[PDB]
């Protein structure tokens, strides 16, 4: 029994175009925006949602089931990640993520992304280590390493999820 943190998507953060599953574990992009209460924590233009739980210390694992189609990115964000207006999806903006775009897997480095030659992903294990300052990604099938960002995190870190195209999704386990 691998001990993973119990995460729920934070509806107060979700872009209004996102459709969250009724268990708040899954996210996809809808065809149209919902009328949601204006909230300071809400991503009003970028297609993002955070978990309701953030981390200041220790080691935390969770898993993300990923769609086969382009349009998703996920990882962690610093709490101060900007919510309002169009923002860059980059480490400078406090986003540390992997992405599926044009049939290829990427670590979202800046100013150019880093192609991962990892083969098809069904489910990814995220290993957040706030003792050492790292976030690592593994393919669950054989636990092959995908990517590690090494960050001297200076604030609370939140699980981050983005879906910018219809026809794909992300789902938190457990």
């Amino acid at each position: 029994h691998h001990h993973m943190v119990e995460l729920t998507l934070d509806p107060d953060t979700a872009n209004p175009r996102l459709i969250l599953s009724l268990d708040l574990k899954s996210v996809r992009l809808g065809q149209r925006a919902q009328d949601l209460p204006n909230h300071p924590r809400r991503f009003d233009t970028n297609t993002r949602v955070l978990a309701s739980c953030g981390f200041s210390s220790g080691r935390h694992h969770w898993e993300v089931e990923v769609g086969s189609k382009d349009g998703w990115a996920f990882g962690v964000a610093r709490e101060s990640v900007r919510r309002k207006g169009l923002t860059p999806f980059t480490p400078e903006e406090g986003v540390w993520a992997m992405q599926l775009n044009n049939g290829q897997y990427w670590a979202v480095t800046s100013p150019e992304r880093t192609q991962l030659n990892c083969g098809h992903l069904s489910r990814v294990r995220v290993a957040l280590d706030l003792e050492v300052g790292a976030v690592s990604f593994y393919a669950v099938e054989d636990m092959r390493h995908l990517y590690t960002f090494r960050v001297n995190f200076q604030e609370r870190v939140f699980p981050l999820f983005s879906v910018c195209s219809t026809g794909t999704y992300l789902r938190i386990w457990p």
Partner: peptide, 12 residues
Amino acid sequence: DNIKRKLDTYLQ
């Protein structure tokens, strides 16, 4: 439409 697809990924 690649225009919407490129414009889509700017919203990530």
